[PDB]
Write a protein that binds this ligand. Structure first.
Ligand SMILES: [Mg+2]
Ligand SMILES: [Zn+2]
Lengths: 79, 86, 167, 148, 225, 51, 86, 151, 218, 220
RNA sequence: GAUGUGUGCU
C-alpha cells in the first residue's frame, strides 16, 4: 500500500531522480525476472519499487552496482 | 519546503502563477503622522522660515516616521515648498 | 535619473538611467500593486523571473577586442561568455547597454526559429530565418514538444544531460 | 400573505419544520426549511456526455485520434495542458501523450504490441505531423531539413 | 403544473402552438387518443355545408432535438367547448398551462456533503415515480447508392454473420417494427459488391417504432415498401 | 490549523488530517440542519427611520 | 537521429532534386473509375502507387515484385505511404 | 459482452494505476492531478471535495477528462509528481491549496462554538471520548461549556 | 430488562393502521422504532405487475383506437395496481372489457389465489361503442424496485417497471406507558400506511424476523 | 425472496487490546446503518456494569475545597475516580476504602481488596501526595447500574458511568459481491475500559438486541 | 476530412 511518496523523496533527494530510479527498478521487476526485495502485499511493480526506495534498500548507486555485478557474473559464466 | 531542485522549469511555473489570477483582475493635502517615534528627512535641502519653521526646497525629499527602536515605520512624500510643523 | 518633469516614467528610461535593479524593482512593485489590490498573493520570484526574461538582448557600445558590430543587438549571454573568455586572455572586452523588450518582443527575438515560428507571425519569422540561412539547435521546452522528444525540464533533464555529454 | 396562507393550511408560519435524520432517527438540531420547489430537468444529460476511448479510428492527413463522441474519438490534450505537464516536470507523461497515444504511426503499433505482450515500453519516433509540416514548408520555396 | 406560477403560463402554452386549440365552439362528439371531433354550435356554422371539424392530434413523433412531441386530449366525450380553448395538450403543458418540470419537496440543509458545491441529493422515490423520466426518439438512416461493380440492394443475405444477427430482420432485410434492439444489432441489411449494412450505434438501446422507406422512380417496389 | 499541522508534522499527517477534517465537518454540518429561511434575513427596526 | 534543423532558401536544382517527377496537366482523379491521371496533380507514376504493393496498370499484385518499376505506366510497385513523402 | 470475469480482472488492472483528471481551462498546473481510481456504478466521475478549490470546479455541470498513464515512468510521474497528495501547497505562493471550504467549515464552525446555557453546562468531562459519548446520547449539547481533561 | 409485545393494532382504514408495542425500556423506543421503520420501508415482500400484453398493441409508444389513453398511460396505471396473490409468486390476470366507460380494476377476471384490493382503480377509459381491450397482466412477487431495463421476448410483451414494496409511509412515535408501579417505561406506536396488500401484524413480525435473522451473525 | 446476504465477521483487527475493530460484509444494501446504529445505541447507553457511584473523603464535605498536602483538587480526584473500571461479583453495591499516606502517587492498587471486587487497572492514579505527614483516606461506594447516570440527576456524588464501552463508532462503506452493484460493509471500531473485551461486548450487545426480537420473530 | 453558421457549456 502506498499513498504519499515523501519518504522515498527524502531518500533519493530529488523527486525527479526518484521517478527514474523507481522506474528502472519497476521495469526490472516487471520485464526482467527479478523479484521484490520487500514482501509484496498485492502491490503493483511501481509501488513495490517505491516501497523499496523508502525502506532504504535500493537507490541509483545500489542499482548500478547490482547491474555491474550481475553483468560480470553472466560474462564469467559465459566462459 | 526546501531549496529549488536543480533542473526544474521555473519559467513555466512563474508564468502560470502570474497568469492564473488573470481572471480575478478587472478589465474595464497634508502629512498626518500616525504613530509614536522620531522623524527623518531623506535628502534634506531646506531652510528655516521667518515663521520659525522649516521649508523644503528639493522635490525628492521623503519624510520617514521611525519607531523608537530604530526601524522605519512610515514614509510619506513631501513636495517642494512645504512648511513643516516639527 | 532625477525628474526634469512630472508624469509616469516608461521602464526603458528607468533601465538605462537608474540601472537594472531599479527597473526590476519598478516592474515588480507595479504588477504586485495591481495584484495585491484584488487580494491575490503571488510571490515575487515569478515576476523577477519574467523580468529576467525581458532583459536578454544587449546593444553594443564599442566592440573592443571582440567581433560584434557597433549597434548590433546581441544576446546578453553571448556577450557575457565572450567577454569572460577575453578577460581570461589579456584582451579587452566589449561594453554593452542592456535592453528591455516586452514579453512579445523578447519571445520573437530569441535564438530558435521554431519556437518563434510556433508562437506568432509565422511567415514573418520563416522569411527572415530562410534568408539568413538560420539553424535551430533544438534546446527549449516547446521545440522538443513539437518534434516529439522529452522536454529538457523534469526527468527529461537527466535524459538531455546524458545526451549532451555524449557529445 | 404567504404566512397567512400557511396558517390557512396548518403549517408553521416560519416555513420551517423539524426534520429527522432518516438513517440515525434523531433530529437535525435545528428547524430546516422544507417546502415545494418546482425543479426542471435541463437536457444536459450525463449519458450524452460520458465518453471513453482506448483505441479507435485515427484521422487521415494528421494521424491523430478523431474528435467528438460520434466518431469514437479522443479528448484533446490541448496546448494549455502541455504547460501543466511541463510545470510538473512530467517529461515522460508528456512524451507518451504526444507520441505514443497520438501522430507517430510506426511507434504507435509497436506500443499496442508491447502492451498486449506484458511489456510497457515505447520505441518512439517522429510525429508524422512534423513531417507534414516539413513537407508544407518545403513545398513553399523554403528548404527546411534535419542536420546530423 | 407549477404550484407557484406567475399567471403567464396559460398564455405561453397557448400562443406557442403545440396544443390543439378549438377553432369554433361546440360539443365534443368523439374523443380518441389520436383525434378529436367537435360538432360546431349552429350559432357558428356557415350557411352551407354545416358539418363538424376534426383535429388530428400529433401522436409520438420526433422533434428537432430528438425528443417526443406528442399531443393528448384534455377533453372528454360529450362536453362543451368554446372558441380558442385547448382540446389537446402539447409537450410539457398541463391543462393548457406551461409546465416545464415537477414540484418536488425540497429541504434546504447540508446532507453529509452530497450537495456540497451546487450538487443535489435526489431521493429514490423521485426515480421510482418515474417523474423525471424523459423520452428521446432518434432516426437512423441507411441509403442505398449505386456504386461501381453494380448498385447496392437491401436484401437480408448477409455473409459472415451469426443467425442471432439476422434473427430480427424480416425477409425484406429491414427490422421488424417493435423489435427491442440494443447496441450492435442489425437494423438494415445492405450489400457491397466486392457489406455496409446499417447497425445500431454503440450503447444506444431502443424499440423500433417506425421504419420508413423512400424510393425514386422505375425501381418497382418491395413488398415492405 | 491545517497550515500549522503541515509545518509541525510534515505531509503525511496533514494529508490524513485533511480528510478527517472533511468527514467530521460534513458529519456535523449535516447533523445540525443548518438551513436558511425567510425569517433569517432580519430587517432592522431602524431601517424605516434611517431612510 | 538528428540534432538540428536548418532552414534556407531553395535553389531550382534543389527543388528538382526533391521532386520525383513533373506535373503538367491540371487534372485530378478522372471522375470515372477513380484512378489518378497520367501527369496530373495526382499520379501513380510520379507520386506512388495508389494501392499498397500493387502497380496501377494491374500487372503486379504481390510483395515478391517489390521495387520493380512497371512498364505500361511506370508505377514502381511499393508502399502507398510514399504518396505522402514524394 | 462484459462477462462477470472482465470485472475484478478490471478491478486489478486498476489497483494502483493512477489516472490524470484534467478540467477544461487548465489555467495553472493544479488543473491536472493524478488520482487513484475507485470504480463506481454510474456515469459521473466522482471528485473529492478538497481538490475542487485547486481545479476551480463547482458541481453545477462541468466536466472532467481522464487520461491514462500507460508506460511505467508515466505512472511513477503521475504518482511522484502529480498525485493529488503531493500538491498541498500552491506553486504561485507558499499558500495552501487544500483549504476546507463552505461546508466543511460551516460544520466545523457550528460544532466548535459555545452557547451561554446548554444541556450540560457545568459537568466536568474526563476526555474527548466522554464528550462524544455524552453528545451522541443527547445528554449534552454540542455547544455546552464543560471542563474537559485533555492530554 | 422487560420485553415489548404487540398489545394493540388499531386498523383505522383499509390501508393505514397503527400497531402498538409496550412496554419498552428507556432508550429502546427509538432503537426498535427506527430499526423497524427502516426494515419496513426497505424490505417488505410485495407483488407488482411486470409484463403486459394488450391485444393489438406492439409497443408502448402507440395508441389503440377506442381507448382515451396512450398505451404508456395504461402501463403507468397498471404499474400502480395493488394485488395480493396468495399461493404462487407469479400469476397472469386477464382483463377483458368492451363498451363505453372506465375500465376499473374490478374488470379483471381474477382467480381465487389473487386479490385486487382496490377495485375502483381506473386503468383506461373506453370511449367507443364497439371498442374492447383484452390484456394479459403478469403479476409477480419480489422486493424493492427492479426496473425493466435491468431484468435479465416477442414484439407484443411490454415491460413495466416493477415496484415490489406494500408499505408507503411508516411513522413511529414513542410515549410513556402506564405500568401499574413503574415509570421511565416507553410505548412504541408504529403508525404505518400500506397499500392494502399486507397485514400490520404480519408486517411487524416480518420486520422483527429480518432484524433478528441479521443479528444471528453473533 | 426471504434470503438475504447473511454477513460474517471478515476480520476482528485488534489494535492494543480493548481497541478492537470488526468488519462484517457483504451486508445487504442499507443494512449497514440499521445494524451499525442498533448495535451502537445498545453498546453506548444500554449495557450493564459497575462504576464508582459516590465517594466520601474524611476531611472534606464540599466539592469546592482542598485537603491539605494533596496535589490534585477534589474536583480532579473525582475525575480520577470516574475512570476507575471495576468488576464486582454477585453483590449489587459495595464500599471500598483508600487509606494511604506518604509522598508519592496513590494508585488503584492501594485500595483494600474486599475479596471479589476486582480492579482492572492497578496502575490507575487517583491522587498525588506531597508530605510524609499527608494522609488521605476515602470511602468509595461502587454500585451496579445500566448505562450512564450523571450526578445532576441524582458524600460527594460522582457521575456514575456504569456501561464498559468507552467509544463505539461504526462506519459503513461500499463493497461488492461477484456482480451485485453496491452492498454495505459495516466497520465497527470499539474501545472498552478493559473490564470486557470488545469482540465480546459486541456479542453481548447483539445478544441484548436479539432477545428483544423473540416475542415476535418467525423462528425462520 | 475541410470550412462555415448557429446554439450551448465552462
Ligand atoms: Mg461550474
Ligand atoms: Zn503498370
Amino acid at each position: 500500500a502506498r499513498v504519499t511518496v515523501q519518504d522515498a523523496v527524502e531518500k533519493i533527494g530529488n523527486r525527479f531522480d526518484l521517478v527514474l530510479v523507481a522506474a528502472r527498478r519497476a521495469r526490472q521487476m516487471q520485464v526482467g525476472g527479478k523479484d521484490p526485495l520487500v514482501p509484496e502485499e498485492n502491490d503493483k511493480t511501481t509501488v513495490i519499487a517505491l516501497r523499496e526506495i523508502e525502506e532504504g534498500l535500493i537507490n541509483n548507486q545500489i542499482l548500478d552496482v547490482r547491474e555491474r555485478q550481475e553483468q560480470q557474473e553472466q560474462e564469467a559464466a559465459e566462459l | 519546503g526546501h531549496i529549488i531542485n536543480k533542473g526544474e522549469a521555473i519559467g513555466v511555473i512563474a508564468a502560470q502563477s502570474i497568469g492564473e489570477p488573470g481572471t480575478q483582475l478587472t478589465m474595464r493635502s497634508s502629512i498626518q503622522v500616525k504613530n509614536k517615534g522620531s522623524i527623518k528627512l531623506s535628502n534634506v535641502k531646506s531652510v528655516v522660515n521667518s515663521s520659525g519653521k522649516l521649508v523644503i526646497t528639493s522635490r525628492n525629499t521623503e519624510l520617514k516616521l521611525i519607531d523608537e527602536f530604530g526601524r522605519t515605520k512610515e514614509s510619506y512624500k513631501v513636495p517642494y515648498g512645504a512648511v513643516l510643523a516639527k | 535619473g532625477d525628474v526634469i518633469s512630472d508624469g509616469p516614467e516608461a521602464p526603458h528610461d528607468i533601465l538605462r538611467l537608474r540601472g537594472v535593479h531599479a527597473v526590476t524593482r519598478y516592474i515588480v512593485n507595479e504588477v504586485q500593486d495591481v495584484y495585491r489590490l484584488q487580494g491575490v498573493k503571488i510571490n515575487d520570484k515569478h515576476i523577477e523571473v519574467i523580468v529576467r526574461q525581458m532583459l536578454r538582448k544587449a546593444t553594443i557600445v564599442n566592440a573592443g577586442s571582440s567581433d560584434f558590430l557597433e549597434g548590433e543587438q546581441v544576446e546578453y549571454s553571448r556577450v557575457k561568455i565572450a567577454n569572460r573568455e577575453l578577460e581570461a586572455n589579456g584582451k579587452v572586452g566589449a561594453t554593452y547597454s542592456r535592453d528591455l523588450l516586452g514579453i512579445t518582443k523578447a519571445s520573437l527575438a530569441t535564438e530558435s526559429f521554431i519556437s518563434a515560428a510556433s508562437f506568432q507571425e509565422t511567415t514573418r519569422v520563416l522569411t527572415e530565418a530562410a534568408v539568413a540561412g538560420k539553424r535551430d539547435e533544438l534546446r527549449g521546452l516547446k521545440e522538443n514538444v513539437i518534434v516529439g522528444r522529452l522536454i529538457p525540464a523534469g526527468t527529461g533533464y537527466a535524459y538531455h544531460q546524458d545526451r549532451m555529454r555524449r557529445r | 400573505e404567504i404566512k397567512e396562507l400557511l396558517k390557512l393550511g396548518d403549517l408553521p408560519t416560519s416555513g420551517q419544520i423539524r426534520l429527522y435524520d432518516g438513517r440515525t432517527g434523531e433530529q437535525f438540531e435545528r428547524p430546516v426549511t422544507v417546502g415545494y420547489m418546482y425543479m426542471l430537468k435541463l437536457n444536459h444529460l450525463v449519458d450524452d456526455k460520458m465518453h471513453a476511448r482506448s483505441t479507435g479510428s485515427y484521422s487521415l492527413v494528421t494521424q491523430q485520434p478523431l474528435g467528438g463522441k460520434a466518431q469514437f474519438g479522443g479528448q484533446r490534450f490541448g496546448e494549455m495542458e502541455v504547460w501543466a505537464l511541463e510545470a510538473y516536470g512530467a517529461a515522460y507523461t508528456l512524451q507518451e501523450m504526444l507520441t505514443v497515444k497520438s501522430d507517430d504511426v510506426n511507434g504507435r503499433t509497436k506500443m499496442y504490441k508491447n502492451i498486449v505482450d506484458g511489456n510497457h515500453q515505447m520505441e518512439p519516433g517522429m510525429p508524422e505531423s512534423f513531417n507534414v509540416l516539413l513537407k508544407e514548408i518545403r513545398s513553399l520555396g523554403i528548404n527546411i531539413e534535419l542536420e546530423d | 403544473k407549477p404550484l407557484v406560477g406567475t399567471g403567464m403560463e396559460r398564455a405561453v402554452a397557448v400562443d406557442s402552438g403545440v396544443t390543439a386549440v378549438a377553432k369554433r365552439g361546440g360539443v365534443v362528439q368523439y374523443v380518441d387518443a389520436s383525434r378529436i371531433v367537435i360538432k360546431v354550435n349552429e350559432d357558428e356554422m356557415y350557411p352551407g355545408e354545416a358539418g363538424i371539424d376534426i383535429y388530428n392530434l400529433t401522436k409520438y413523433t420526433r422533434s428537432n432535438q430528438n425528443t417526443c412531441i406528442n399531443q393528448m386530449p384534455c377533453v372528454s366525450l360529450g362536453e362543451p367547448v368554446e372558441r380558442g380553448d385547448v382540446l389537446a395538450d402539447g409537450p410539457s403543458t398541463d391543462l393548457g398551462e406551461l409546465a416545464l418540470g415537477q414540484n418536488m419537496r425540497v429541504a434546504f440543509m447540508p446532507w453529509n456533503g452530497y450537495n456540497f458545491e451546487d450538487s443535489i441529493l435526489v431521493s429514490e422515490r423521485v426515480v421510482q415515480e418515474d417523474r423525471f423520466t424523459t423520452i428521446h426518439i432518434q432516426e437512423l438512416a441507411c441509403v442505398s447508392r449505386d456504386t461501381k461493380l453494380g448498385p447496392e440492394e437491401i436484401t437480408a443475405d448477409i455473409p459472415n454473420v451469426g443467425e442471432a444477427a439476422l434473427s430480427k430482420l424480416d425477409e425484406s432485410g429491414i427490422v421488424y417494427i417493435g423489435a427491442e434492439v440494443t447496441g450492435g444489432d442489425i437494423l438494415v441489411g445492405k450489400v457491397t459488391p466486392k457489406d455496409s449494412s446499417l447497425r445500431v450505434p454503440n450503447g444506444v438501446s431502443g424499440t423500433v417504432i417506425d421504419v420508413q422507406v423512400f424510393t425514386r422512380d422505375g425501381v418497382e417496389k418491395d413488398k415492405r415498401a | 490549523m491545517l497550515n500549522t499541522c503541515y509545518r509541525i508534522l510534515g505531509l503525511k499527517p496533514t494529508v490524513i488530517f485533511a480528510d478527517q477534517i472533511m468527514y467530521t465537518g460534513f458529519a456535523y454540518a449535516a447533523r445540525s440542519g443548518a438551513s436558511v429561511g425567510i425569517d433569517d434575513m432580519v430587517i432592522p427596526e431602524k431601517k424605516h427611520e434611517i431612510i | 537521429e538528428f540534432d538540428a534543423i536548418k532552414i534556407a532558401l531553395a535553389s531550382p536544382d534543389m527543388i528538382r532534386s526533391w521532386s520525383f517527377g513533373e506535373v503538367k496537366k491540371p487534372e485530378t482523379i478522372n471522375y470515372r473509375t477513380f484512378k489518378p491521371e497520367r501527369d496530373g496533380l495526382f499520379c501513380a507514376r510520379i507520386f506512388g502507387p495508389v494501392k499498397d504493393y500493387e502497380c496501377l496498370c494491374g500487372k503486379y499484385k504481390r510483395l515478391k515484385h517489390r521495387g520493380v518499376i512497371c512498364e505500361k505506366c511506370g508505377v514502381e510497385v511499393t508502399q502507398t505511404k510514399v504518396r505522402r513523402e514524394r | 459482452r462484459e462477462e462477470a470475469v472482465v470485472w475484478d480482472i478490471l478491478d486489478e488492472v486498476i489497483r494502483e494505476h493512477p489516472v490524470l483528471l484534467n478540467r477544461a481551462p487548465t489555467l495553472h498546473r493544479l488543473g491536472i492531478q493524478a488520482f487513484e481510481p475507485v470504480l463506481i456504478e454510474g456515469k459521473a466521475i466522482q471528485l473529492h471535495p478538497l481538490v475542487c478549490a485547486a481545479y476551480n470546479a463547482d458541481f453545477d455541470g462541468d466536466q472532467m477528462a481522464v487520461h491514462v498513464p500507460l508506460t511505467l515512468e508515466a505512472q511513477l510521474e503521475a504518482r511522484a509528481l502529480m498525485m493529488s497528495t503531493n500538491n498541498i501547497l500552491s506553486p504561485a505562493n507558499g499558500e495552501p491549496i487544500i483549504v476546507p471550504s463552505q461546508d466543511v467549515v460551516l460544520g466545523l464552525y457550528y460544532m466548535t462554538r459555545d452557547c451561554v446555557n446548554a444541556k450540560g453546562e457545568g459537568m466536568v468531562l474526563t476526555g474527548p471520548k466522554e464528550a462524544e459519548r455524552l453528545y451522541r446520547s443527547g445528554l449534552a449539547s454540542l455547544h455546552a461549556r464543560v471542563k474537559v481533561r485533555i492530554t | 430488562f422487560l420485553k415489548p409485545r404487540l398489545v394493540d393494532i388499531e386498523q383505522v382504514s383499509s390501508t393505514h393502521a397503527k400497531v402498538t408495542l409496550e412496554p419498552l425500556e428507556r432508550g429502546f423506543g427509538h432503537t426498535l422504532g427506527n430499526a423497524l421503520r427502516r426494515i419496513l420501508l426497505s424490505s417488505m415482500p410485495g407483488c407488482a405487475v411486470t409484463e403486459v400484453e394488450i391485444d393489438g398493441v406492439l409497443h408502448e409508444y402507440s395508441t389503440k383506437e377506442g381507448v382515451q389513453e396512450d398505451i404508456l398511460e395504461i402501463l403507468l396505471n397498471l404499474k400502480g395496481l395493488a394485488v395480493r396473490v396468495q399461493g404462487k409468486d407469479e400469476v397472469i390476470l386477464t382483463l377483458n372489457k368492451s363498451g363505453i366507460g372506465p375500465v376499473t380494476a374490478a374488470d379483471i377476471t381474477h382467480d381465487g389465489d389473487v386479490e385486487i384490493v382496490k377495485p375502483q382503480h381506473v386503468i383506461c377509459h373506453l370511449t367507443d361503442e364497439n371498442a374492447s381491450i383484452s390484456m394479459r397482466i403478469k403479476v409477480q412477487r419480489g422486493r424493492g424496485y427492479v426496473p425493466a431495463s435491468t431484468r435479465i421476448r416477442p414484439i407484443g410483451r411490454l415491460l413495466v417497471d416493477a415496484c415490489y414494496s406494500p408499505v408507503e409511509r411508516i411513522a413511529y412515535n414513542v410515549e410513556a406507558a402506564r405500568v401499574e408501579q413503574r415509570t421511565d417505561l416507553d410505548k412504541l406506536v408504529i403508525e404505518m400506511e400500506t397499500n392494502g396488500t399486507i397485514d400490520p401484524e404480519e408486517a411487524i413480525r416480518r420486520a422483527a424476523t429480518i432484524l433478528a435473522e441479521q443479528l444471528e451473525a453473533f
